[PDB]
Symmetry: C2
Amino acid sequence: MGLISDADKKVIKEEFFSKMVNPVKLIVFVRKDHCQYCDQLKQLVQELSELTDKLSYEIVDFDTPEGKELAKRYRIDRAPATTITQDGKDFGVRYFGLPAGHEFAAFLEDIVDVSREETNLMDETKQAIRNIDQDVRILVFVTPTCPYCPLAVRMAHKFAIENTKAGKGKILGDMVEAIEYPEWADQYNVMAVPKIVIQVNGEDRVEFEGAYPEKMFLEKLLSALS
Amino acid sequence: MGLISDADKKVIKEEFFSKMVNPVKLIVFVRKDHCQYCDQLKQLVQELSELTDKLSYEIVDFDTPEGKELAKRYRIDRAPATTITQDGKDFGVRYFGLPAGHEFAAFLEDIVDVSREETNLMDETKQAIRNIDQDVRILVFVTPTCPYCPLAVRMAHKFAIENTKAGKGKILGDMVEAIEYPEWADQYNVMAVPKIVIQVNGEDRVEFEGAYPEKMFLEKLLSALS
Ligand SMILES: [Zn+2]
Ligand SMILES: [Zn+2]
């Protein structure tokens, strides 16, 4: 039932989904082993798609040969994962795990921006991001209780949307819910969050902790591109 | 080196350790397998004991038959764990994992209260806590980035100190650093923190999320004692 209260539904419809333009499809990858919150993720996306005719979803079994083929196409290497697409078009906007806590609002805002295919990034930032031609993966490790984590996840996602808009689609912005991916978090000594890891061509280049303002965050990414 | 800066040392000495009365001994349990931050914990306690002659420590290897005997005596069932004692006397004040983030200040405050063998708990709360005669274990799951988590950990620890003072010593207040104990956190569906689990006689009785004020927190514990 109410993973989303009826009062919440009204707010979501009025303050978020009323701003949608193009149809968005939530492609969710799940599996049978080690998916503690997979059912919650499943029901969340289903309840959200009932609030508007511009939102749809597709549940994919990562364990199947079919799911593996789809994942590869969407550059997904783990499950649970959700990529927010514009009618199936990959925008590099992904969430690994459950978007709980204030990550929920970031999830909704991401849906709107992919739908609008634009962001509120500063002009200078947009110019730089749209010029990036290298494969970049931005991992943003977060925990459910983290006031500033959403800012970092949204920044990574705005970068991905703009690069996709430019026709490159080379930036992957990945929110990673640490509680659900302990081995991955441990790999990067994640304690304080948000912890950001920028990889270029599959190799680590820059790692830092904290939600940095737009200008400083951009600077970090550009420096990793050296 | 500086897990603790020299400026930090001055603050610690002046605002915390200057208030100590009786000697405190930090008994730390470590192991070889799955102790990612064991070395950091080790160096932290060693650096802290250098700031005052009223603080000492003892590193115990949980893997050894000797360490297992000591752990049993200190009611420790996992490693890494640190119990804050008054010259070796068990006060039910434990930390499972690294006291990073603002848990560091809570760690220092706990050292002072065990040293003083008293707390700032309200009179009514003290009266009720000192009367508890049942075995109670309060688990407080936290993450490094969690503004209100320290409040809950300190409340659990103040309860343990008072019950020990009363001559009962039946309350165990356990801070559990979720990142380091994922299996344990998963067992209790820990997402939002702090998540509190109150067990009486080894069995779960009450589970809730959030730092509740003193009165409400006490109410929760008493209700589990029914
Ligand atoms: Zn409104
Ligand atoms: Zn001062």
